[PDB]
Structures are given as C-alpha cells and as structure tokens.
Ligand binder design. Structure first.
Ligand SMILES: Nc1ncnc2c1ncn2[C@@H]1O[C@H](COP(=O)(O)OP(=O)(O)OP(=O)(O)O)[C@@H](O)[C@H]1O
Length: 434
C-alpha cells in the first residue's frame, strides 16, 4: 500500500484527502476500503452529489481493484452492490441529490466515502453528515479543490471539525505516475502555469491580494434591492465591449438606476455584427445612454452606432479607459487626477465602492443611500450569466504605479499572466458607472 496514506488506517471520525489530478488518491482509498472490507463486517456507503446512473459511481474502480489484487473469488458482484462472502461486508452507492429519502433511511453505516467531494454543496453535507451517526463511524472524503469559498473546502480545510486527519497530496507523491498523465501535465505546465497550479498542484482559486472586489460583496450585492427594500430609480445605461479579433466573447451590460438588469455575452460575432447586437439590446432595454470601448478595434464603430440610434433619444459615447480620469483637476471625494491613473481605474473603483457599500448595508446593518449602492437582479439577469460575471469581477487586479496612483492590470496583461480570457462582462459592467 502507498505509504503516505498510513494515517488513514488509524481511527478518525474525519479522514480527508485533498489534491490535484494524478495523485493516486482515488486508487489508494479504493485499495484501503477493499482491504478493510475483507476483515470487518463494515457497511460502506459510497455517496456522491450527482449519480444519474450506476456508471457515474466508484463501483467500476472497486471492481478493478478487486480484480487487480486477485481477490475476485471472495466478492459477490452485482449491478449496484459489492459484498464480501466471508465478512459479509457491504458496499452501496447512492447520489445525495437523487435519493435524499433513501440516504436518511439507511441504517448501520460504518464508513461513508464521499468522492469528487468538491462538487458536493452545503445542503448535501447537512443532509448526509447526520445520517452517518453510528458510533466510531468515519466519513472519508477525497477531492480536488476548486474555489476557496466553496463549502467542502470551508468545512475541512478552513474551519475543520474535531478529529480530522488531513492529507495533502500531488502527483509529486505518486510512485506509479502514468505517462498518459505525465504528458497532459507537462503540456499544461508550459501552456498555462496558472491553470497548472490549480489543476495539478491542487491550489484552490482564491482572492488575489491585488483584487479590488471581494466575492462576499458580490453575494451580498445580489438582490440587495430586495433585501433592503428599494426600487430601481434613475436613467438606464447600456455598455458594449467589442473585445478583439480573438475568440473572446463580446460583452453587454445594462442597468436601471442602482440595479443591474441585463448581462449578455455575444458569441461568434465580428465587430459590426457585435455592434448591431449590443445596439439592439440597448434599444430593447430602453437605454437612455449607451457607451462602448473604442480604445481598440472599437474606434471606428462611431458612425454605425449613431445611425442605429437614429430617431431615438440615446446618447452614444466612445469610452476610453486609458485616457486621463474624468474631471481630473477636481478635488478627490489632492485631486482626482492624483488618485487614479486613467478612466479605467476610476470606474472599476466607483464600482467597488458601490459594492462595498451595499455589502456594509446588507451585512452589517449600516445605512447608505440607494443611489450609492449596486444591486444585481437575479431573476432578470438569470443565474448562468450572473455566475460568469462574478467569476470575472474577482480577477480584476491592482498593479504597481510609480507615481502613487491607483492603476489596474490591463486585459491583455491579465490574459497573458492569469491565462484567463478577457473579462468583457466586467469591462462592460464597469463602463456603466459613467
Ligand atoms: N498504488 C498504485 N499502484 C499503481 N498505480 C497507481 C497507484 N496509485 C495511483 N496509481 C496511478 O495513478 C493514477 C491516478 O490515480 P487516481 O485516479 O487515484 O488519482 P486521483 O487522485 O483520483 O485523480 P483524480 O482527481 O483525477 O480522480 C491512476 O490511474 C493509477 O494508474
């Protein structure tokens, strides 16, 4: 048996293994679980978040282990069950989303193994954990970490329970590391160091220290006009971000007063189609104002935009983020110009203060004028889009400036350094602060 896992044979209420791909932690566990089964009448539940059929489950890998060691002649193998013929030990495999009624009813569970545990939401941990309540029962947990603010990572790494054996492992710890995987992993290290550290060295997605917007604010911000009770009041503003000539997706944002109402992504579109797209959406959303990025490829859109808005009262404006700050000589509320390097920084910061405010209002009770907060309308926007947006905002980053000014990493630099695509929803949403 693979020696790092030695602490698991001892008796802990919580046994957790976290790591990257190819760290041999599914194989090891299936091994230990099998060996335990040959020597004790243990009822072993194997639970996952989603199990739409039996093939999604860890049964195939227990059949493979069983055959690999040569134990085949000891076990009974059916469709949804494995049983040891001597000890009478039993494996069963359910999904926590599919059969919550069945999982509460189960009786006498000694060992529960959650696998692919990173997908397991909080509502499932709350349903499961009490059901494994026999004394000296253990709950075994394997997982690759995604975001640092997901429940599973919170529950065991951040705010651990009592009696936890926490093992960390990478491929750097796998004695039998297949070439099939060594290949995928070398390709990755070279093409995208940042995705590599996520995937293979199992480092979770966390807030950078240079980040201007906290995830928590965004959550707080969601439906914050429904939580504090105030309505969308103001002009409607729409923003289009034309992206580039690359694969990256076009952005459109839009709000009514302090409430954001549409976040749309524009796909498979050139500059003019993309132009026609956002232009119609701004008409559709009854925009009073409509801006767009002209810094790059968007510079020549001007004529096509004003022609689209002919007949309607809609101000169209080419926004340039690299230009000096709006009202740069005005004092800061030391001048504006002293404080921001360009309009791009100015308006991401407007956004963040707005967010931060709402967050203080929603979460600590502190008053703030609804004209100063920001609220995401979840029904309007639709949770898919909403999530894409939140993933992007939280990567917007501060970079050093030699004159003490506030300045952001440019989209090109984020793409180059973070290996992420261009944050065009964020950039579209940012432009709405004007
Ligand atoms: N004890 C072992 N003996 C032989 N090969 C092993 C052993 N442990 C791991 N391996 C090899 O390393 C590979 C990775 O194993 P495993 O699937 O457990 O990794 P994992 O941590 O579950 O990764 P993932 O997160 O992709 O599920 C396996 O396919 C296997 O071929």
């Amino acid at each position: 048996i693979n020696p790092i896992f030695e602490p698991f044979i001892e008796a802990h209420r919580y046994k957790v293994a976290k790591g990257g791909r190819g760290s041999g932690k599914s194989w090891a566990i299936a091994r230990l679980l099998v060996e335990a089964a040959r020597r004790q009448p243990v009822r072993i539940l194997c639970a996952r978040e989603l199990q739409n059929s039996i093939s999604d489950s860890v049964i195939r890998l227990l059949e493979d282990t069983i055959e690999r060691e040569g134990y085949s002649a000891e076990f009974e193998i059916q469709r949804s069950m494995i049983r040891h013929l001597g000890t009478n030990a039993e494996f069963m495999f359910y999904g926590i989303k599919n059969n919550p009624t069945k999982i509460k009813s189960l009786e006498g569970i000694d060992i529960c193994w959650v696998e692919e545990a990173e997908a397991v939401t909080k509502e499932s941990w709350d349903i499961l954990i009490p059901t494994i309540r026999k004394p000296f029962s253990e709950i075994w947990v394997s997982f690759n970490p995604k975001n640092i603010l997901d429940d599973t990572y919170q529950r065991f790494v951040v705010n651990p329970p009592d009696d936890i054996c926490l093992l960390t492992v990478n491929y750097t710890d796998n004695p039998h590391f297949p070439e099939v995987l060594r290949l995928e992993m070398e390709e990755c290290k070279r093409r995208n160091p940042t995705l590599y550290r996520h995937i293979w060295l199992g480092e979770p997605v966390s807030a950078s220290d240079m980040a201007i917007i906290k995830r928590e604010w965004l959550e707080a911000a969601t439906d914050a006009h429904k939580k504090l009770g105030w309505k969308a009041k103001g002009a409607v503003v729409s923003a289009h971000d034309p992206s580039d000539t690359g694969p990256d997706a076009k952005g459109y944002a839009s709000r009514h007063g302090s409430v954001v109402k549409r976040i749309a992504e524009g796909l498979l579109m050139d500059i003019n189609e993309g132009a026609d797209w956002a232009t119609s959406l701004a008409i559709e959303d009854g925009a009073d104002h409509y801006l767009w990025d002209g810094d790059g490829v968007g510079a020549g859109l001007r004529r096509q935009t004003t022609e689209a808005f002919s007949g309607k009262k809609i101000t169209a404006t080419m926004f340039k983020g690299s230009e000096s700050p709006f009202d740069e000589d005005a004092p800061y509320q030391r001048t504006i110009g002293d404080v921001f390097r360009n309009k791009r920084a100015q308006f991401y910061y407007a956004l963040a203060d707005r967010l931060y405010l709402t967050y203080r209002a929603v979460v600590h009770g502190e008053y703030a004028d609804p004209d100063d907060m920001l609220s995401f309308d979840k029904e309007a926007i639709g949770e898919k889009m909403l999530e894409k947006l939140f993933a992007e905002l939280t990567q917007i980053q501060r970079k050093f400036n030699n004159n003490g000014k506030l300045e952001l990493m440019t989209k090109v630099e984020m793409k180059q350094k973070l290996g992420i695509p261009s944050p065009n929803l964020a950039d579209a949403l940012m432009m709405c602060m004007h």
